[PDB]
């Protein structure tokens, strides 16, 4: 959508599939700043947006 | 500015006490196997202040 009207989704009750991220060739950037990409799979969270 | 001082940021394992290590091996941070080439998957263990 229009940038001033950017779109949002709440996500919960699901199992993350980071394999697609790690396998992605087409992305220009995949980078996580609050936690390292290897420490993702073993952490659990109460919401994601 | 000063950028002559560097520190080690990646390693395959943690140092034992009073160990010392100066090797500049390319850590296989990314999913693809590094073969003597840098990139978005392979990083240099050292970073400057």
Swiss-Prot record, chain A:
Q: What does this protein do?
A: Attaches the virion to the cell membrane by interacting with host receptor, initiating the infection. The major receptor is host ACE2. When S2/S2' has been cleaved, binding to the receptor triggers direct fusion at the cell membrane. When S2/S2' has not been cleaved, binding to the receptor results in internalization of the virus by endocytosis using host TFRC and GRM2 and leading to fusion of the virion membrane with the host endosomal membrane. Alternatively, may use NRP1/NRP2 and integrin as entry receptors.
- Organism listed in the record: Severe acute respiratory syndrome coronavirus 2
Name the gene for this chain: S
What happens upon changing residue 28 to F? In strain: Omicron/BA.1, Omicron/BA.2, Omicron/BA.2.12.1, Omicron/BA.2.75, Omicron/BA.4, Omicron/BA.5, Omicron/BQ.1.1, Omicron/XBB.1.5, Omicron/EG.5.1
- Give the recorded effect for residue 29 to A: In strain: Omicron/BA.2, Omicron/BA.2.12.1, Omicron/BA.4, Omicron/BA.5, Omicron/BQ.1.1, Omicron/XBB.1.5, Omicron/EG.5.1
Q: What is this protein called?
A: Spike protein S1
Its quaternary structure? Binds to host ACE2. RBD also interacts with the N-linked glycan on 'Asn-90' of ACE2. Cleavage of S generates a polybasic C-terminal sequence on S1 that binds to host Neuropilin-1 (NRP1) and Neuropilin-2 (NRP2) receptors. Interacts with host integrin alpha-5/beta-1 (ITGA5:ITGB1) and with ACE2 in complex with integrin alpha-5/beta-1 (ITGA5:ITGB1). May interact via cytoplasmic c-terminus with M protein. May interact (via N-terminus) with host bilirubin and biliverdin, thereby preventing antibody binding to the SARS-CoV-2 spike NTD via an allosteric mechanism.
